[PDB]
Design a protein around this ligand. Structure first.
Ligand code: AZM
Ligand code: AZM
Ligand code: ZN
Ligand code: ZN
Lengths: 260, 259
């Protein structure tokens, strides 16, 4: 068992999960000294992202975040291999410190961060098998900041009060996932990293979009207050907050950008 | 332990339990956790003008370069008297010269100086005080690249003498107060820990608000003059990026002596 605070917190993950203390760890801070423009970084193509409204997708509180299961028919085109979706989830802070993104830019956190996880379907049958193997995963990261109300993100957030406790699930009708992506997706940061949660396998090709999306103060507060990492029948509930990993050392390396 | 590799910071907790415990330092000094406190009056640095006729030990311990300080120098202004034991530094590398431990509004500084003191009213020495309540007080000075600093050079000029792990050299006494920034009355104050194993949560931190400046040449010397390996080692390793990543610090338990 692992957590984001306490005895089983991130500084202790390496005890049970060796890779968490290994190489190519994520997340990292994106700042000028280690950024480099690469004109070869072309735009990714998002296929099958417009999920059928006649299909239902499982939303689950897994005790670490709120996740939405995604179908393998939606995928990313533009990488060396085809990567098919498996799930999306988020990371956030808390009402008193609403800056819980995992990746930071010039030392600055964003309010939250969305991760759309994909696995190499050309080499592996599923995300489980691909997770601990070479070039097994590709994650898209969307930085989130407080601003205007976001109807698209609310297609997920409107169900939060129904997955308040660990293990609980709800069904979300399909909608266009591309609606969760920011403007100018052609502009992004790219680097080889790891899962930001145990086992921390260094098998993730990260793509962090340059521009953030906005959600309202109310939407952000709901995300920061509606969930608990404990079961509903728990006499001592524990709020699911600050579920992001601290940035990791990033030395002798460069993060390449598709923008100058 | 080291600052990189299997024995790196994410693995410190395997051998040193407190590194995975509470009140860990360093932290990001940002508005969300700050709180102005008028009770935080100016500290007085006594006995800091070390006799130029006396020599003080400079040592490369494989983790940093440290200078031993006499117990007669101490901080005045805190509840108990804290006597000095040593000072040392933390820095980054030439390609990414941002190796301070603490950050301000998410920003790292080029380097950071720590002047370590122990509670001499409660404990007999630094070693005994290290893992006990109210045992330590560290003064942190943020360092950025700028104009040449003659005072810091009183230390840097001796770096080649302690180039390798285990090496020692003598440094004539000078006024340590010269290493402090302007307006020392302005600082951040919080209860934290040692930033290296055993990471004991016994440190009262005082991070001065304003940074000092050292020249690009001084910073480069610091980033390239030392090795964490012994003299003539078959695989020499440069001493760089010897700082710990910032730790989560939830509650607004960081106080400032300024508004
Ligand atoms: C989806 C899956 O199999 N697990 C993951 N664990 N952490 C992930 S993250 N935060 O790096 O995107 S994805
Ligand atoms: C002084 C001493 O014996 N050890 C120290 N270890 N870490 C220290 S720090 N980086 O928190 O100031 S001081
Ligand atoms: Zn994630
Ligand atoms: Zn130190």
């Amino acid at each position: 068992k692992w957590t984001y605070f306490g005895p089983d917190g991130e500084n202790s993950w390496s005890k049970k999960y060796p890779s968490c203390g290994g190489l190519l760890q994520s997340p990292i801070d994106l700042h000028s000294d280690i950024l480099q423009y690469d004109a070869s970084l072309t735009p990714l193509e998002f296929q099958g992202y417009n999920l059928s409204a006649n299909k239902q997708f499982l939303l689950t509180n897994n005790g670490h975040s709120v996740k939405l299961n995604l179908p393998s028919d939606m995928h990313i085109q533009g990488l060396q291999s085809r990567y098919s979706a498996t799930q999306l989830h988020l990371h956030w802070g808390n009402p008193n410190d609403p800056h819980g993104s995992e990746h930071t830019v010039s030392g600055q956190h964003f309010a939250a961060e969305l991760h759309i996880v994909h696995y190499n379907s050309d080499l592996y049958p599923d995300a489980s098998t691909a997770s601990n193997k070479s070039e097994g995963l590709a994650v898209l990261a969307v930085l989130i900041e407080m601003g205007s109300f976001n109807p698209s993100y609310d297609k997920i957030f409107s169900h939060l009060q129904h997955v308040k406790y660990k293990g609980q699930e709800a069904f979300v009708p399909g909608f266009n996932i591309e609606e969760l992506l920011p403007e100018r997706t052609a502009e992004y940061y790219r680097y080889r990293g790891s899962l930001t949660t145990p086992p921390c396998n260094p098998t993730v090709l990260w793509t962090v979009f340059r521009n953030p999306v906005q959600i309202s103060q109310e939407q952000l507060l709901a995300l920061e207050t509606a969930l608990y990492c404990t079961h509903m029948d728990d006499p001592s509930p524990r709020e699911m907050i600050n579920n992001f990993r601290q940035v990791q050392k990033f030395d002798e390396r460069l993060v390449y950008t598709s923008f100058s």
